Design brief:
Layout: E1 29-30, E2 36-37, E3 42-47, E4 53-58, E5 63-67, E6 75-79, E7 85-94, E8 105-106, E9 113-121, H1 127-130, E10 137-146, H2 154-159, E11 169-171, E12 187-192, E13 203-208, E14 212-214, H3 216-222, E15 253-254
Parallel strand pairs: 1-8, 2-15, 10-13, 10-14
Antiparallel strand pairs: 3-6, 4-5, 4-11, 5-7, 6-7, 7-9, 9-10, 12-13, 12-15
The protein binds resorcinol (RCO) (4 copies) and zinc ion (ZN).
The site of one resorcinol has 6 residues, from strand 5 and strand 7.
Protein name: Carbonic anhydrase 2
Enzyme class: lyase
Family: Belongs to the alpha-carbonic anhydrase family.
Length: 257
């Protein structure tokens, strides 16, 4: 099935998912000099105080921390968004090496990893109806660089050895995603897509300018996970990032002067 290898990676996905070559695919390179400040952007609001995490899952292409989204609890609003978007899961993409791993790039610079906090537009009732809409989803993307440890990531790192292989899950209650944010909420935003199959064009992307720092040791624990299931040949879960796609007829907007 699809993956990140030579034989089933990003350059192959268009054969099962023709929208891979569509008009608003993600990720993209963010050219910081051509992005334009947009005074029409409203203040961004990340409201994660009542977030209810449930579980952490290795799905064979990343690990997802999943949330109870059956009520307004952890939401994103403001900035480019109309209405309220509810947090359902987050996950990361990372490299085999510190020099690559992110999906978005900034003036062609690749970060060591990228966090995606996925939210759906509550006008559409649930996530599955939201992914049928061009404004169904909003993803907060956050770059990771290797330097000082991020304390609010350590509870994630310490449970990874319990979900080493595809299809494994563990309880992951009482996790506070506010510990994964940087200080500043300055961001770039543009319309795009899922970066994994089915690559649907539903997404308002909001990519924070300030990266978080994680330690070498934290990111090395991500690279011990496996793409395969238990009892199949071991393939390390590394380089699970899609490269930058053509910008096409889009402009990237900046929240900051
Ligand atoms: O916006 C630009 C224009 C020319 C070279 C480049 O790296 C970026
Ligand atoms: O693990 C999950 C839970 C919810 C939505 C999704 O895309 C993945
Ligand atoms: O965390 C989740 C995962 C799947 C569906 C859902 O509504 C929430
Ligand atoms: O599950 C998702 C949802 C939206 C964008 C993305 O890259 C992944
Ligand atoms: Zn992602």
């Amino acid at each position: 099935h699809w993956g990140y290898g030579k034989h089933n990676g990003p350059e192959h996905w268009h054969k099962d998912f023709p929208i891979a070559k569509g008009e608003r695919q993600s990720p993209v390179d963010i050219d910081t000099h051509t992005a334009k400040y947009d005074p029409s952007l409203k203040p961004l609001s990340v409201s994660y105080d009542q977030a209810t995490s449930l579980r952490i899952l290795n799905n064979g292409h990343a690990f997802n921390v999943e949330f109870d989204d059956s009520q307004d609890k952890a939401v994103l609003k403001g900035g480019p968004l109309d209405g309220t978007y509810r947090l359902i899961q987050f996950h990361f993409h990372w490299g085999s090496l510190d020099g690559q791993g992110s999906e978005h790039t900034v003036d062609k610079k690749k970060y060591a990893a990228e966090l995606h906090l996925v939210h759906w537009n509550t006008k559409y009732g649930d996530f599955g109806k939201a992914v049928q809409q061009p404004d169904g989803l909003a993803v907060l993307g956050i770059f990771l660089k290797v330097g000082s440890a991020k304390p609010g990531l350590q509870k994630v790192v310490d449970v990874l050895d319990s979900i080493k292989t595809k299809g494994k899950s563990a309880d992951f209650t009482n996790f506070d995603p506010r510990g994964l944010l940087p200080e500043s909420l300055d961001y770039w935003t543009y319309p795009g897509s899922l970066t994994t199959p089915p690559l649907l064009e539903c997404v308002t992307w909001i990519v924070l300018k300030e990266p978080i720092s994680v330690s070498s040791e934290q990111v090395l624990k991500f690279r011990k996970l496996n793409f395969n299931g238990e009892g199949e040949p071991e393939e390390l879960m590394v380089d699970n990032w899609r490269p930058a796609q053509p910008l096409k007829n889009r402009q990237i907007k900046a929240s900051f002067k």
